Structure formats: structure tokens, C-alpha cells
Design a protein around this motif. Structure first.
Motif, mmCIF file in Angstrom:
data_model
loop_
_atom_site.group_PDB
_atom_site.id
_atom_site.type_symbol
_atom_site.label_atom_id
_atom_site.label_comp_id
_atom_site.label_asym_id
_atom_site.label_seq_id
_atom_site.Cartn_x
_atom_site.Cartn_y
_atom_site.Cartn_z
ATOM 1 N N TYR B 96 36.397 -38.085 -25.606
ATOM 2 C CA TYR B 96 36.704 -38.331 -24.266
ATOM 3 C C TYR B 96 36.287 -37.031 -23.114
ATOM 4 C CZ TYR B 96 39.551 -42.092 -26.268
ATOM 5 O OH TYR B 96 39.849 -43.292 -26.918
ATOM 6 N N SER B 97 35.393 -37.287 -22.299
ATOM 7 C CA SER B 97 34.967 -36.237 -21.478
ATOM 8 C C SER B 97 35.885 -35.657 -20.364
ATOM 9 C CB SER B 97 33.747 -36.491 -21.135
ATOM 10 O OG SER B 97 33.778 -37.514 -19.804
ATOM 11 N N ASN B 98 35.422 -34.956 -19.587
ATOM 12 C CA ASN B 98 36.299 -34.493 -18.409
ATOM 13 C C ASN B 98 35.905 -35.413 -17.303
ATOM 14 O OD1 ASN B 98 37.499 -32.250 -19.716
ATOM 15 N ND2 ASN B 98 36.064 -31.129 -19.133
ATOM 16 N N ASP B 99 35.262 -36.450 -17.593
ATOM 17 C CA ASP B 99 35.105 -37.436 -16.675
ATOM 18 C C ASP B 99 35.918 -38.635 -16.965
ATOM 19 O OD1 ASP B 99 33.482 -38.512 -14.385
ATOM 20 O OD2 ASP B 99 32.894 -40.244 -15.723
ATOM 21 N N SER B 100 36.476 -38.770 -18.193
ATOM 22 C CA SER B 100 37.457 -39.657 -18.540
ATOM 23 C C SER B 100 38.926 -39.547 -18.116
ATOM 24 C CB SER B 100 37.702 -39.630 -20.203
ATOM 25 O OG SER B 100 36.559 -40.320 -20.669
ATOM 26 N N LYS B 101 39.434 -40.562 -17.538
ATOM 27 C CA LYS B 101 40.740 -40.439 -17.205
ATOM 28 C C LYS B 101 41.887 -40.577 -17.950
ATOM 29 C CE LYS B 101 39.969 -43.502 -12.856
ATOM 30 N NZ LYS B 101 40.365 -44.707 -12.219
ATOM 31 N N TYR B 102 43.027 -39.656 -17.513
ATOM 32 C CA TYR B 102 44.123 -39.597 -18.232
ATOM 33 C C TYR B 102 45.458 -40.134 -17.238
ATOM 34 C CZ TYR B 102 42.021 -37.263 -21.964
ATOM 35 O OH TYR B 102 41.081 -37.039 -23.269
ATOM 36 N N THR B 103 46.529 -40.507 -18.143
ATOM 37 C CA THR B 103 47.678 -40.886 -17.700
ATOM 38 C C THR B 103 48.892 -40.021 -18.426
ATOM 39 O OG1 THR B 103 48.989 -42.956 -17.441
ATOM 40 C CG2 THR B 103 47.766 -42.695 -19.484
ATOM 41 N N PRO B 104 50.115 -40.000 -17.876
ATOM 42 C CA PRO B 104 51.032 -39.145 -18.928
ATOM 43 C C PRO B 104 51.524 -40.016 -19.915
ATOM 44 C CG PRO B 104 51.896 -39.347 -16.678
ATOM 45 C CD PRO B 104 50.467 -40.138 -16.786
ATOM 46 N N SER B 105 51.927 -39.461 -21.105
ATOM 47 C CA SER B 105 52.365 -40.575 -22.111
ATOM 48 C C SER B 105 53.596 -41.396 -21.754
ATOM 49 C CB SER B 105 52.936 -39.505 -23.373
ATOM 50 O OG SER B 105 53.391 -40.388 -24.304
ATOM 51 N N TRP B 189 48.008 -29.863 -22.613
ATOM 52 C CA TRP B 189 48.612 -31.170 -22.262
ATOM 53 C C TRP B 189 48.246 -32.405 -23.283
ATOM 54 C CZ3 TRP B 189 49.992 -32.066 -16.260
ATOM 55 C CH2 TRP B 189 50.760 -31.464 -15.917
ATOM 56 N N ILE B 190 46.803 -32.288 -23.456
ATOM 57 C CA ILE B 190 46.105 -33.389 -24.448
ATOM 58 C C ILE B 190 46.815 -33.065 -25.931
ATOM 59 C CG2 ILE B 190 44.086 -34.140 -25.402
ATOM 60 C CD1 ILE B 190 42.721 -33.554 -22.753
ATOM 61 N N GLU B 191 46.602 -31.750 -26.372
ATOM 62 C CA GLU B 191 46.897 -31.488 -27.611
ATOM 63 C C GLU B 191 48.620 -31.766 -27.866
ATOM 64 O OE1 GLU B 191 49.262 -28.747 -29.011
ATOM 65 O OE2 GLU B 191 48.614 -28.478 -31.093
ATOM 66 N N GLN B 192 49.431 -31.457 -26.838
ATOM 67 C CA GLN B 192 50.862 -31.582 -27.100
ATOM 68 C C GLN B 192 51.336 -33.126 -26.951
ATOM 69 O OE1 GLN B 192 53.518 -28.870 -27.427
ATOM 70 N NE2 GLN B 192 51.366 -28.068 -28.163
ATOM 71 N N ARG B 193 50.359 -34.105 -26.467
ATOM 72 C CA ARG B 193 50.752 -35.297 -26.089
ATOM 73 C C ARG B 193 51.341 -35.805 -24.856
ATOM 74 N NH1 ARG B 193 52.674 -39.262 -31.079
ATOM 75 N NH2 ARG B 193 51.457 -40.857 -30.521
ATOM 76 N N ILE B 194 51.148 -34.696 -23.974
ATOM 77 C CA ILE B 194 51.932 -35.055 -22.569
ATOM 78 C C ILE B 194 50.974 -36.137 -21.896
ATOM 79 C CG2 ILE B 194 52.620 -33.958 -20.586
ATOM 80 C CD1 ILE B 194 53.007 -31.331 -22.202
ATOM 81 N N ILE B 195 49.904 -35.817 -22.000
ATOM 82 C CA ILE B 195 48.964 -36.878 -21.118
ATOM 83 C C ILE B 195 48.072 -37.426 -22.111
ATOM 84 C CG2 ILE B 195 48.996 -35.280 -19.166
ATOM 85 C CD1 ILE B 195 46.202 -34.371 -19.597
ATOM 86 N N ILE B 196 47.538 -38.796 -22.021
ATOM 87 C CA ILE B 196 46.764 -39.589 -23.105
ATOM 88 C C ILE B 196 45.604 -40.150 -22.154
ATOM 89 C CG2 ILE B 196 48.929 -39.722 -24.926
ATOM 90 C CD1 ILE B 196 49.111 -42.483 -23.796
ATOM 91 N N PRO B 197 44.605 -40.520 -23.095
ATOM 92 C CA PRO B 197 43.445 -41.323 -22.299
ATOM 93 C C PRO B 197 44.145 -42.631 -21.899
ATOM 94 C CG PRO B 197 42.769 -40.514 -24.391
ATOM 95 C CD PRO B 197 44.354 -40.030 -24.413
ATOM 96 N N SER B 198 43.725 -43.004 -20.407
ATOM 97 C CA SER B 198 43.907 -44.101 -20.012
ATOM 98 C C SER B 198 42.898 -45.229 -20.171
ATOM 99 C CB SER B 198 44.129 -43.912 -18.303
ATOM 100 O OG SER B 198 44.594 -45.083 -17.832
ATOM 101 N N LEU B 199 43.283 -46.016 -21.273
ATOM 102 C CA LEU B 199 42.383 -46.872 -21.720
ATOM 103 C C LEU B 199 42.707 -48.456 -21.233
ATOM 104 C CD1 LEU B 199 42.461 -45.480 -25.536
ATOM 105 C CD2 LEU B 199 40.524 -45.222 -23.726
ATOM 106 N N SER B 200 41.679 -49.021 -20.567
ATOM 107 C CA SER B 200 41.616 -50.371 -19.882
ATOM 108 C C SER B 200 40.822 -51.192 -20.804
ATOM 109 C CB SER B 200 40.927 -50.395 -18.450
ATOM 110 O OG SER B 200 41.725 -49.307 -17.776
#
Ligand code: CL
Ligand code: CL
Ligand code: CL
Ligand code: CL
Lengths: 200, 200
Positions: B96-105, B189-200
Motif C-alpha cells: 500500500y503506497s502513500n497514494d493509498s487511502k487509510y481509515t481509522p480502525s 499508526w499503521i504498525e500499531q493498527r490505529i489506521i488501516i487501509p480503506s478497502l472498497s
């Protein structure tokens, strides 16, 4: 080389030693004198304004160039002198409400270094706020991203706490407990003389 | 009062003791049993859904009402169970690049208390992020204002790091060292699982 040129060259050496006390410790007696002898013989040291000497020595050093760690440490040191010497307008001692606008102190500076200039030049992104407080003492502290943003924005256009808190309302949770934490932070910046009333 | 009603009342007592282990320590054996006997005799404890018991006991307690410090501590405790039990979508393990969207867990919660629920109910504005990490352990940490704002904004609309960093460019100093500090925070925040990829 007349008696006047010798006098001003000695005053240059002495002023540089005073402004760059930390940097000076990363060099030998001979190495430090060599740096200075080079500056004094350079065109930048021909300024008729003694106040411009510390800054011209920094630019001399950046052109040599010295290491990136020493250059960051030199900029940090110069910034302290800029805070020591900054003119801060007289502020009448009256009541300023949270409807009253604030601006950062002209003696407050935001710095970004790739080295730990506060410790021992560790390669590590460092963000600092350098300023002069109510007791006329130079202070520095780590600056987090929210704070950096607010000070930068506030530098663009004087802001009241009421205006700050209202703008953030839409990017914050519905429960307004954060407004109390924020006011605490804002009040602390007033006590430390980081922000001052914007008097027209 | 049949054998089934007695069984579910004992399961209610046992579940409450398990969910509110810290709160329970501010009460006596008799005081704690009284609270529970009252809940069990109340209309809120007549729910056919056992999962709803911890939350209904909290609302029972808020209506009594218990002190504001105990009520905050109860909400904190309930929030931990909400993070323990939250369903977090399966995330394919790809790039998941830095162009990929994230959402909080969905297992991440922002809480604001007027009491220190992490220590001993001190009257002091406290801001916490409660979540479940990659190792499925419930974690909590103090949340500063920038972070609270970003998570809240991110909860409104999935965001990429590139979009985040570009939006802040105008409210930050010209030197872009902050982008590196920010990416560090974002990666953590990604490592700690605070935010996760936003998968549609
Ligand atoms: Cl001079
Ligand atoms: Cl640097
Ligand atoms: Cl039940
Ligand atoms: Cl509270």
C-alpha cells in the motif's frame, strides 16, 4: 594593516567566540583559530556593521562548507542571539480577553534541523521553538506539529483564542473538552511570552 | 423466579465483575453487590441480548447517578471491551503506497474525560485513544490535539498520506522537514493498527 583594522579583527574573534560557544567545543584551538583567520581575510568580514558579524561568519562557514551537523548547530546558536536581541513591542498591562488578537513574539523563531542541535548532533529530525520569555531569558523547546502549524498560521494573521477555537470546531469531536485543553496551551504561550497581544 | 432467570442473573453479575474490574475496586463488597442487585431488578437488565449487559449497567449507573469520576472510569472500561470485541476487516497483505487511502480502525476510539481514568480519577482534562493492535491486545494512549483532529477528520473521509501532507503544506513552514516527522507518525499508526487501509 593599521591599528584600527587590528582592533576590529580582535573584536570579531571575541564576538564569534561569544556567539558560538557550543560549536567552538567541536574544534581544536588551532582548528577554531584557522576558521576565524579565514573569515577575517574574507570579503564578508569587511562589513562596517559589527552586528552583522555573527551572521556573516555563519554564511562563511556554510560556504566552506563545515559539516551539516556543525552548520545546524551554528544556526541554532545564531537563532539564540536573534532572540536575545529581538525588539519586542511594549505591551500595556491591561485586560485582554479571548476576543483579543495575538501574534507570535518577534523574539520567537521556528527552526527545523536534521540533527539534534540541543544534545550532540544526532542525525534525527528536530523541530524547535526558540524565544525570549517574560524574564528576558532565551528559551528553546521541542515543537510538535500542531503547535508549529498554529504559530506559522498566527504569524500570517493575528488571531484571537475565540477565532482559533471556533475554526477548529469542525475538525474535532462534538464533545468540547478539547477547548479547555487548548485554552490551557494558549494561556501558557502568553505566560512564556511566545505570543503577545497584537496592538494596532 | 424460575431456574432460568436465576441462571441469567448470575451470568449478569459475573459479566459485570469481568468488564468493570477497576471500577469494582472503588467499592466495598456490599456496595458493589447492591449496585448489581439494583441493576438486575431494573428494566434495563431484561434485555434478551447478553452482549448488551455491560452497556446497560453503565447507563443504569449514569441514571443513579454514580460520581462523575466513577462514571468516566466506567465508560473507559466499557470502551476497552468495545475495542476487544470490534470487528476489523481482513486486510490483504500487499503493498500500500502513500497514494493509498487509510481509515481509522473500527476498533479505535477517541475518549474525553474530565477525570484521570488511567490513574486515580484526578479532576484533570484527559484525552485518550483506545484501540486494538496487530497482536490483538487492547491499548490506550494519551492523544494530543493534532492527532485527535486527524483521526476525527480521517473518520469523516478516508485519506492518503499524500493527501494529508499536501493539505498541510499551506499551514506549515516552507522547509519540508515536518513531512518526514509526519510520515514517521503515520507509519507508527499503521504498525500499531490505529489506521488501516480503506478497502472498497
Ligand atoms: Cl566590525
Ligand atoms: Cl539541518
Ligand atoms: Cl442476558
Ligand atoms: Cl468525564
Amino acid at each position: 594593516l593599521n591599528v584600527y583594522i587590528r582592533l576590529i579583527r580582535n573584536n570579531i574573534h571575541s564576538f564569534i567566540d561569544r556567539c558560538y560557544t557550543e560549536t567552538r567545543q567541536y574544534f581544536d584551538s588551532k582548528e577554531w583559530s584557522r576558521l576565524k583567520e579565514g573569515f577575517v581575510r574574507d570579503a564578508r568580514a569587511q562589513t562596517p556593521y559589527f552586528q552583522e558579524i555573527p551572521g556573516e561568519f555563519l554564511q562563511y562557514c556554510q560556504s566552506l562548507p563545515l559539516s551539516d551537523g556543525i552548520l545546524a548547530l551554528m544556526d541554532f546558536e545564531y537563532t539564540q542571539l536573534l532572540a536575545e536581541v529581538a525588539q519586542i513591542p511594549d505591551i500595556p498591562d491591561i485586560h485582554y480577553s479571548n476576543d483579543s488578537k495575538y501574534t507570535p513574539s518577534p523574539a520567537a523563531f521556528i527552526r527545523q534541523y536534521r540533527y539534534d542541535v540541543t544534545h550532540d548532533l544526532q542525525e534525527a529530525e528536530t523541530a524547535l521553538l526558540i524565544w525570549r520569555n517574560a524574564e528576558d531569558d532565551v528559551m528553546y523547546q521541542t515543537l510538535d506539529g500542531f503547535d508549529m502549524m498554529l504559530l506559522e498560521i498566527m504569524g500570517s494573521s493575528a488571531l484571537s483564542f475565540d477565532t482559533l477555537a471556533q475554526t477548529l470546531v469542525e475538525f474535532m469531536p462534538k464533545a468540547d473538552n478539547w477547548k479547555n485543553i487548548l485554552l490551557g496551551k494558549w494561556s501558557g504561550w502568553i505566560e512564556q511570552r511566545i505570543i503577545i497581544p497584537s496592538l494596532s
